[PDB]
């Protein structure tokens, strides 16, 4: 009985492979052959924000391109000001172990989550001038790995028990549960039109979900190990993935298959974070080799290096208007490159 | 070229910095430990005199020294992802059960995986061997045999140089020394020397267990101090 099921599954998989192969006539590299290179770039650190006393685990640029929030291991979540390197708020957390934070699009909420399996929401703008906890969303069975705001009243969470959830803040209970993965879910990314998001887990497979129904639409497998970060192209029809094999990959949704890869021989370490530029011509990256790289999005030619840290880089971010790039690391310092 | 509001904001930032300095300085006085045991090992009954599904915490103080011990019971069988956080702790505590002979190889494989990890090449490990009285009762019973599971126990070298406990059945000493040497062999096979292991023996009802941890954390810190003064 079950063997017949496995047989039809294998036949359908082979048919899918043939169907996805049939559409590949000419690759991306042979098309972009005649393009003037972007030349060479070099950026110098413009600022340095100090004040943390432990490792930094996450950050998130504000929507007004001036404010940002950072989360540390010592248990404090603090908000900075980029231009005048001041401090606006410092929030003491209940649990010291914190691995993810998110900053609301409206500008008056923040979210926090870690090993305690609870996502906590803090409200910023209120009377009496202190930050107080609004909600403590619980219902997961593994460590929270990522969280993102959809609207002012909706949040999506990716946990470490092979599942993702969509919540309603006021009600305080889940309304949709995405469960297709088989390994730990590590990364999550939304889309500009706010209708579908992508997820990446430890079983070396990325998935394209839908926010309304709750059904998987496409799955992509092209990696040899677990993936640690994911980004999404500004156009809305492509994305880039990074694993700990020192190989980044670019995938297209409509073609349903891989397009191009970025890799080299001198680098054999893992990748911790990726991000695209405003026009999409460049691709940032963060390695365990105590530095960062800059890849061309069309040619896979290393066109710059940013090295100012002594420990590994944990978080990377690009401003909405494309003016600066912020990088944090494990030496309690995060820097701004322009 | 600076308004009054900017000056007030700068004063606010300086006050926040002062508070952060004080709070961070206060926290360093305590020491940190990670307790992890496979199963059927009684890791809960290690220190009982002195004493949130994802994280469990236990605080105990000896000689004014404060120790925070973290035990995690809400995670899965695979622990390769949430262990990167614990790379700044003082020492890891490992607890096994030597009474049961069916699951010793699993414990050895777990210890080998932990010892040869990538983010734990500077963290030394304290090892405990729990439930020794059951071991004694089982070995004097004469039903279970070690040659069936471990073929090298049949031909063994007498531990004459080592000092056995004063007054004891030689068979018990032979078996327990073989078991301990089994773990110490895995400990020393790499032979790197960056970190070392401290084996111990523990009974079911023992009142003193914080003293052993204290006089081992002291040795760990002494080794670090000897290393960073260029004396070694």
């Amino acid at each position, epitope marked *: 009985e079950l063997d017949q099921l496995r047989q039809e599954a294998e036949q359908l998989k082979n048919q899918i492979r043939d169907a996805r192969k049939a559409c590949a006539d000419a690759t991306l590299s042979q098309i972009t052959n005649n393009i003037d290179p972007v030349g060479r770039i070099q950026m110098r650190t413009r600022r340095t924000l100090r004040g943390h006393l432990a490792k930094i685990y996450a950050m998130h640029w504000g929507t007004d391109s001036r404010l940002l929030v950072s989360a540390s291991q010592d248990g404090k979540l603090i908000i900075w000001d980029s231009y005048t390197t001041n401090k606006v708020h410092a929030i003491p957390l209940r649990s010291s172990w914190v691995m993810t934070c998110a900053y609301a699009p409206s500008g008056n909420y923040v979210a926090c989550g870690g090993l305690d399996n609870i996502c906590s929401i803090y409200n910023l703008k209120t009377r009496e001038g202190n930050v107080r906890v609004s909600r403590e969303l619980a219902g997961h069975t593994g460590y929270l790995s990522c969280c993102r705001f959809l609207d002012d009243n909706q949040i999506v969470t990716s946990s470490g028990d092979t599942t993702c959830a969509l919540w309603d803040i006021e009600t305080g209970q889940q309304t949709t549960t995405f469960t297709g993965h088989t390994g730990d879910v590590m990364s999550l990314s939304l889309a500009p039109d706010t209708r579908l998001f992508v997820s990446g887990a430890c079983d070396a497979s990325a998935k394209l979900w839908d926010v309304r129904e709750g059904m998987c639409r496409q799955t992509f497998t092209g990696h040899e190990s677990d993936i640690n970060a994911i980004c999404f192209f500004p156009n809305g029809n492509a994305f880039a993935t990074g694993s700990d094999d020192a190989t980044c990959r670019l995938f297209d949704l409509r073609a349903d298959q891989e397009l191009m890869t970025y890799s080299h021989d001198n680098i054999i370490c893992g990748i911790t974070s990726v991000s695209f530029s405003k026009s999409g011509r460049l691709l940032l990256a963060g390695y365990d080799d105590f530095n960062c790289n800059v890849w061309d999005a069309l040619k896979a030619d290393r066109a710059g290096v940013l090295a100012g840290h002594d420990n590994r880089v944990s978080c990377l971010g690009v401003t909405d208007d494309g003016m600066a790039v912020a990088t944090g690391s494990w030496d309690s310092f995060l820097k701004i490159w322009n | *070229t600076v308004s009054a509001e900017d000056k*007030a904001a700068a004063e606010r930032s300086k006050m926040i910095d002062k508070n952060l300095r004080e709070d961070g300085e206060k926290a360093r006085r305590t020491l940190r430990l990670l307790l992890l045991g496979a199963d059927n090992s009684g890791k809960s009954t290690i220190v009982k005199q002195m004493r949130t599904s994802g994280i469990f915490e236990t605080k105990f103080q000896v000689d004014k020294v404060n120790f925070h011990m973290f035990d995690v019971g809400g995670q899965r069988d695979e622990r390769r992802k949430w262990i990167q956080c614990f790379n700044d702790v003082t020492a890891i505590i490992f607890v096994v059960d030597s009474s049961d002979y069916n699951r010793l190889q699993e414990a050895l494989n777990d210890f080998k995986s932990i010892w040869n990890n990538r983010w734990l090449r500077t963290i030394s490990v304290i090892l405990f061997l729990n439930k020794q009285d059951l071991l004694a009762e089982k070995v004097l019973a004469g039903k279970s045999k070690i040659e069936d599971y471990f073929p090298e126990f049949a031909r063994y070298t007498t531990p004459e140089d080592a000092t056995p406990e004063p007054g004891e059945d030689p068979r018990v000493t032979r078996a327990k020394y073989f078991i301990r040497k089994e773990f110490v062999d895995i400990s020393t096979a790499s032979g790197d020397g960056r970190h070392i292991c401290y084996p111990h023996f523990t009974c079911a009802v023992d009142t003193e267990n914080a003293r052993r941890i204290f006089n081992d954390c002291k040795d760990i810190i002494l080794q670090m101090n000897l290393r960073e003064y260029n004396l070694v």
Partner: single-chain antibody, 228 residues
Framework: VQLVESGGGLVQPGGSRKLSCSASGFAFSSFGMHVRQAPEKGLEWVAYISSGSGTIYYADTVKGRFTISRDDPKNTLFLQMTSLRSEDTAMYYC??????????????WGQGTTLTVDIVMTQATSSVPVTPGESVSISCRSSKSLLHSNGNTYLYWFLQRPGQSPQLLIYRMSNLASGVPDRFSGSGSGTAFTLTISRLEAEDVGVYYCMQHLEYPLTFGAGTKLEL
């Protein structure tokens, strides 16, 4: 969030007095504190105490004989007055303010207690007859430019109802306060500022003031009275 005051009464010249302002309902140590009104004149600034008692300012008219202190665990502050004159009869208010990026200072005003014994800002209009259901506008002129290098124009609009304490309406010339209906609006350019009210109706008749906050001391306007 409430402020209460104790002190006052008839005082002979050459004496001394102490006024006490107590707060209840908010975090008192995070805020900075500040204002008197003559019987038939607009508001005038007096003195300022910072948070943590790290900065104190006094006005030139009141320099040398006035002291301000604060008790944080008790959540109170005191003003001690010595060597009074015959021109110091007024009513005194207790005001809070907090300064960071995007904040709204001067957002709350106390009741005020009566006691009986530089940038020049001018407001032209004194009394304007208005018809209900009609839009109105008010102007406020300035002597030197208030626009700063970074692009912020520091100017505040205050409304005072009859027999009440004033409340904030517009801060930094464009934004709106909390709980203020959207009918009010403000606009202008360098050294020219206007407040516009559309679909005007009842309960909005009072006295309006324009204040600058570019540098100390802080100078108010002459005021404007609305009549039916």
């Amino acid at each position: 969030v409430q402020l209460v005051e104790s002190g006052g009464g008839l005082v002979q010249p050459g004496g001394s007095r102490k006024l006490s302002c107590s707060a209840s309902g908010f975090a008192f140590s995070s805020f900075g504190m500040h204002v008197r009104q003559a019987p038939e004149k607009g508001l005038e600034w007096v003195a300022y105490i910072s948070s943590g008692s790290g900065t104190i300012y006094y006005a030139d008219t009141v320099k040398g004989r006035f002291t301000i202190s604060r008790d944080d665990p008790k959540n109170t502050l005191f003003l001690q007055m010595t060597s009074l004159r015959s021109e110091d009869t007024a009513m005194y208010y207790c005001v809070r303010s907090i300064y960071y990026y995007g904040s709204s200072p001067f957002d709350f005003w106390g009741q005020g207690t009566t006691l009986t014994v530089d940038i020049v800002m001018t407001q032209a209009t004194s009394s304007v007859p208005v018809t209900p259901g009609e839009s109105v506008s008010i102007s406020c002129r300035s002597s030197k430019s208030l626009l700063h290098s970074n692009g912020n124009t520091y100017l505040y609009w205050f409304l005072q109802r009859p027999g009440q304490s004033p409340q904030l309406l517009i801060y930094r010339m464009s934004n709106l306060a909390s709980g203020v209906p959207d009918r009010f609006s403000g606009s202008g350019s360098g050294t020219a500022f206007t407040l516009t009210i559309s679909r005007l109706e009842a309960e909005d008749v009072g006295v309006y003031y324009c204040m600058q906050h570019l540098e100390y001391p802080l100078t108010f306007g002459a005021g404007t009275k609305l009549e039916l």
